[PDB]
């Protein structure tokens, strides 16, 4: 505590992550949301790169301001410290990742089938913890929360097939 002292920075990452998720799910100004359309494409394996436009985030913040809601400056936070927001946006995309509408066939990449295999394996190990603890007979919320403490799953960075990039916000659109 005396060593490695704490500092008070104006950056709150919890509501910044909430804003990131809201922007990913609700932004549609560029038929539905642009970014879930892109994540749906990624799920079906037509795209392996996610480009996050800073113009889109700035426009989303401007629209939120126009309707009266006070939104944190996500664009400025990304510009000041961009390494953390690649990490953040990847987690947010993983949370809102649509299920693929195309099944895995023999013409898919080896990386895609490996990721599908480990995803199914970790969901099966979750289910196996759950069934074992149910058989032990010791609320489903607590049961689940025990399961994710006693599971060694594949982390999201190992079940991840896309790449994240930040397109700078245009000078005219600044």
């Amino acid at each position: 505590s005396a060593a490695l002292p704490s500092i008070q920075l104006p950056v709150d990452y919890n509501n910044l992550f909430n804003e990131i998720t809201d922007f990913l799910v609700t932004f549609k100004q560029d038929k539905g949301p642009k970014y879930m359309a892109m994540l749906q494409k990624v799920a079906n394996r037509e795209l392996n790169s996610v480009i996050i436009d800073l113009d889109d985030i700035l426009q989303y913040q401007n629209e939120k301001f126009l309707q009266g809601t006070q939104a944190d400056d996500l664009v400025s936070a990304i510009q000041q410290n961009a390494n953390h927001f690649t990490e953040l946006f990847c987690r947010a995309i993983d949370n809102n990742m649509p299920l693929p509408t195309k099944e895995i066939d023999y013409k898919d990449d080896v990386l895609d089938v490996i990721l599908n295999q480990r995803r199914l394996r970790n969901e099966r190990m979750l289910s196996d913890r759950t069934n074992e603890i149910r058989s032990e007979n010791l609320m489903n919320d607590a049961l689940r929360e025990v399961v994710e403490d006693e599971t060694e799953l594949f982390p999201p960075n190992l079940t991840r097939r896309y790449f994240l990039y930040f397109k700078p916000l245009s000078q005219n659109c600044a």
Binding site: I133, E136, L138, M139, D141, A142, L143, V146, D149
Partner: peptide, 27 residues
């Protein structure tokens, strides 16, 4: 004990001690 405690908290603990007793023949 971790499983029981977490499953029972909804209506950290240290390593538990084994206090073993017996009624067998005594030296």
């Amino acid at each position: 004990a971790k499983r029981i405690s977490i499953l029972s908290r909804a209506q950290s603990l240290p390593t538990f001690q084994l206090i073993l007793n017996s009624n067998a023949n005594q030296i």
